[PDB]
Ligand binder design. Sequence first.
Ligand SMILES: CC1=C(C/C=C(\C)CCC[C@H](C)CCC[C@H](C)CCCC(C)C)C(=O)c2ccccc2C1=O
Ligand SMILES: C[As](C)(=O)[O-]
Ligand SMILES: C[As](C)(=O)[O-]
Lengths: 73, 739, 210, 211, 41
Amino acid sequence: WVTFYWHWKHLTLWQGNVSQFDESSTYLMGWLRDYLWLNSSQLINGYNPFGMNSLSVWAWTFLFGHLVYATGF
Amino acid sequence: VKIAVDRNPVETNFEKWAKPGHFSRALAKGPNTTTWIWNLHADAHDFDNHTSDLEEISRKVFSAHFGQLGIILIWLSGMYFHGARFSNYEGWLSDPTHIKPSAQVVWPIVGQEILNGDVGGGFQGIQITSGFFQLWRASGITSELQLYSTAIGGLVLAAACFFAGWFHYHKAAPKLEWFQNVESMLNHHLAGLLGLGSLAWAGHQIHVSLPVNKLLDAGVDPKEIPLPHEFLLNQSIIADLYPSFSKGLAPFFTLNWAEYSDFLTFKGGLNPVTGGLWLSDTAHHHLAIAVLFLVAGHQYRTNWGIGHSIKDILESHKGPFTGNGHAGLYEILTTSWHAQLAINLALFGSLSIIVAHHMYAMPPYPYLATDYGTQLSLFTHHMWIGGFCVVGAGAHAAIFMVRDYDPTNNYNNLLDRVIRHRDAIISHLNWVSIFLGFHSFGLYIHNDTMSALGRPQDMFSDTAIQLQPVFAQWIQNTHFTAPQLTAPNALAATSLTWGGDVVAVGGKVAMMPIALGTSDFLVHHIHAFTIHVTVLILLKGVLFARSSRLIPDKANLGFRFPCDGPGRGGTCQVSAWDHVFLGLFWMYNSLSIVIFHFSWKMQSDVWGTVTDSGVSHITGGNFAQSANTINGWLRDFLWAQSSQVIQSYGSALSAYGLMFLGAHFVWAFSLMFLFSGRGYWQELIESIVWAHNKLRVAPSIQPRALSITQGRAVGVAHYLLGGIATTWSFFLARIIAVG
Amino acid sequence: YLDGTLPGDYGFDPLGLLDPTVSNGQGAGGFVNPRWLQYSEVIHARWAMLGAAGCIAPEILGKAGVIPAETAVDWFRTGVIPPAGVYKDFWADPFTLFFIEVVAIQFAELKRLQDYKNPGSQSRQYFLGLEGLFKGSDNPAYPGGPFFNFANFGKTEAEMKKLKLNEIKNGRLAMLAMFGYGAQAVITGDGPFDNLLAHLADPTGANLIT
Amino acid sequence: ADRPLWSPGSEPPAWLDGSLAGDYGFDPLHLSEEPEMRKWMVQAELVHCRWAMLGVAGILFTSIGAKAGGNFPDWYDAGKELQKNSDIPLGSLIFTELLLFGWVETKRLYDLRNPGSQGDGSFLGITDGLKGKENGYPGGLFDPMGMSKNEASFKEAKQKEVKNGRLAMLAFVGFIAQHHATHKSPIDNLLDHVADPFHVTFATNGVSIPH
Amino acid sequence: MKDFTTYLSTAPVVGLGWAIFTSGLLIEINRFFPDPLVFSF
Ligand SMILES: CC1=C(C/C=C(\C)CCC[C@H](C)CCC[C@H](C)CCCC(C)C)C(=O)c2ccccc2C1=O
Ligand SMILES: C[As](C)(=O)[O-]
Ligand SMILES: C[As](C)(=O)[O-]
């Protein structure tokens, strides 16, 4: 929670739209939409039939983390 | 076979209600601990735990059956009355193509009225995905004035159903001689309840096929359509509509069935304009069902030396390997209700899932193929119900084996032979699950690795290296060439999912043939893997319930216990109850995978809108080169299709997003229970009780934490609740914004 | 196990629904038991007789020149099943007549049910001076009394049993006849007597098959 | 076997035989089974009767005045047009009503919990009066005429007010049912039925007419 | 009647009677008084 807060604060600050945070940090649908669903398009598109790029290894590791999480479960 | 009941077996009085837990003498003494309430709830229906009087148990079951059917009938009456009082059913009926079904209107209190989505028909409300308007249109309903009376009849029948339950429990409580009439129960369920009902419903569809097939599909307003009674009696009307009538009903007496071709017709398929099917096919099918189930209920000797009983048939079936088989299975069934219940639920959920598969690709209603939402809803609903029923059959098998079983009178060489190699099956299914996991799941890992390493020409693909099935394609080929080669009298194939002929109604394609490639191959292997693992869990729970390799004295510990002790390194989740616990999770996994496959296939390679030049689907065919990788399911399906559920606060679909987040919440909440124990919680309750006793406000009933079994039950309950609710919200908010 | 003492007993009960084995315990209970069943069949025979003639009396009596052809009408075209027909000019309309008959018939019935639940209980309470007429009898099917039996034939019990069996035979035959009127009025859609004239004129022509 | 019952032959309830006025053994929902609930329901029915009789009497008299020629509205929609041109505002009338009725209904209540509690002389020194003669039948001041100082006449005179009140409260349900159908006065429904019995019910909306 | 009144002290009573009273009261206060988010003063 602390890291989500810090990260999304500085993310709304770096886009020059701190008002985005000041307006969407009030409820949970914002945290789910404006932060999790939104700032991940390069994770999904790290590798695709069109062709991968430098962000492919990080996407595969992002999936590796979920695999380890599910093994923990 | 006769009737045997008793008069006033239990006097009707409100006393036994004042003492909760009377049925359990251990509970009736008093609630000295808060576990008393949870045991009251978890044992009220445990009829074989109240007492070993199987007569009283059968009476309790035969009464709870009416208790359930009363609720069923009140539910159907409530649906009909919602459709009657407040709904756009007339508006939908006058224009089914664009007007959407709505039968729930909220109250203006705190802004919830935004949920009253603008559906047209001069009325606003909540869109319903249950499928009642399309089901009612097939009955010639022209105005709202009929659903009121239909609901009245249903409610009267439900009242009479509760009356019959009370009557057969407190005034006409039967005896085990009547309950155990397997001959009568079959020949009256199979022949009467099924055959007579099917014949009645076929005769109904025969005399109601006038409005739907001809008038409703000719732009005739429902008010303009003559009422059904005006179609039934007047012979001139039914002579003008279908020339086969008014002949004199001659061909049916002398069995010269030649002139009856206008209402018992066999066509197959549907017109790309009519949207739905025809009622003549369903009428012929129901007459076939009626005749079949009516003749089948006449193959058992009951009284007049005609036929053969079940016991002789069971005795006259023996082989070289087994020898003396089927010795007491008749007693197996006639003794315990749990055996019959498990045997029923075994294939009951399977046939529910089969009904789902036969409904998604064969919509048996008018003006619903374009309704891309009702199909998904009903399909997923029936599949989850089937999964639960199968897991419940797995549970009740062990339940039977625990209480109502003894290999002395119910002895059978079949069952003991199954038991004597109860370990080779488990070991070989373990090996087969390992095979499938390394050979159905590892392929996705390989594909992700290849796509990430910068070698797209090496990844498994329908273009790089093909791995698609042919056996399913050969079945589709045998079905496609079936007309005129192996099915002469047939016109079309079994379904339009493999026969081209893209049928579209108002831009939206009502049906387009379904392809089967490497993606479907991989996903069906994943399905087989998950189903085999679930069956492994359930069967290893059922078998290792009477005895095992570790603890021989396992039957005395019962069916519902968490463990035996931390000895021999640790014993946890050893009871069949815990195996059902894990089988619920595995059934969740398997059914979820299957429903996601269904949704994404239907949205990628089936559904869409047809333009002047071909059909433009919802998605740009993203199913081909995304299913071959685990990231694809997050690349174009989960990430892409989740925009509406999180973007629906501005419309009447915000409740879907609310349920979405709440289901996530309850899921993690279940994780809480699943990962914790009782020691920590019991000591925390200890300190809280300390805090209480300082002000003298603690309760007289000893507040204890939940039982280990109840802890796991709450865990699995919240877990499946959150999971199913999140997936429901997703599949129900995504499919409304694309249809 | 059908001793034959019952008036209209002939040993016909393949279903054996009358046996004393069913309804083992004693109490109010259900309806499948001899006390209810024989009484119910006598009630059905009584109604069926009272209706079998009432379904064919106006039509036969209209073919003759005694009753006006206006009132003579088919039994199913008099107002019951108003879709088929409704006699337009009575002194009142069908719903008013139906409320009348509801009140009267349920007096008649509920005062009959109470006596079956409580034998003879209807003479106890003062009922506008008609109590001595409602005293009942040992067999509830056969109450008898001053009004109900204003003259007496069955003074001797042998003659009485003969009367009972004659009445029961006529009643069950009239029950067959009533069910004959119904299904026969469905196919032909014509009065029961006219079907007899149409048949006797050309028996094979107006038989059961074609 | 000692009194007429409602259902001839049925067994009367064991908690009421002949002590209550208008007793016929009619209680299928086991109400007023305990002594306290019966002491409550007796006086509840009594007050229902004493209001229903006055209501029906006023309604019938105003209706007869209207039909004869008097300037009298019908029983329905009479509080609407008598308030439009009245000097006493609504609300100021309602709370005056409630203020006058609370003080008397409270004294009526606490004479049920402990009879004779009101005859201690605290209210204007009234001692002999304001003492509950029985459950729901006070006296002394409410009975100026010595018409209850004889049990032989009183047990017979009180057993008929309950019947008149039951009939009056059945008539009041007739007033409501007989308005939603015809929208006419109760006396008008009578003259339109004696002059011609053919204008009986089941003719306007009593039964559904889809055919 | 007596056993019924005794039965009416369990979950099917206050816990139903309660929380029905409370849901009704809150809904009525939010209906007559449409949208409060701050006190009068
Ligand atoms: C929290 C927790 C508990 C404690 C569970 C508790 C305390 C459940 C109690 C909550 C209920 C809902 C209390 C509600 C009862 C109220 C006092 C009265 C009801 C309110 C009325 C209005 C109906 C376990 O027992 C447990 C067991 C095994 C693994 C994990 C856990 C675990 O995590
Ligand atoms: C019925 As007789 C006694 O007159 O024969
Ligand atoms: C109604 As017909 C006489 O034509 O069977």
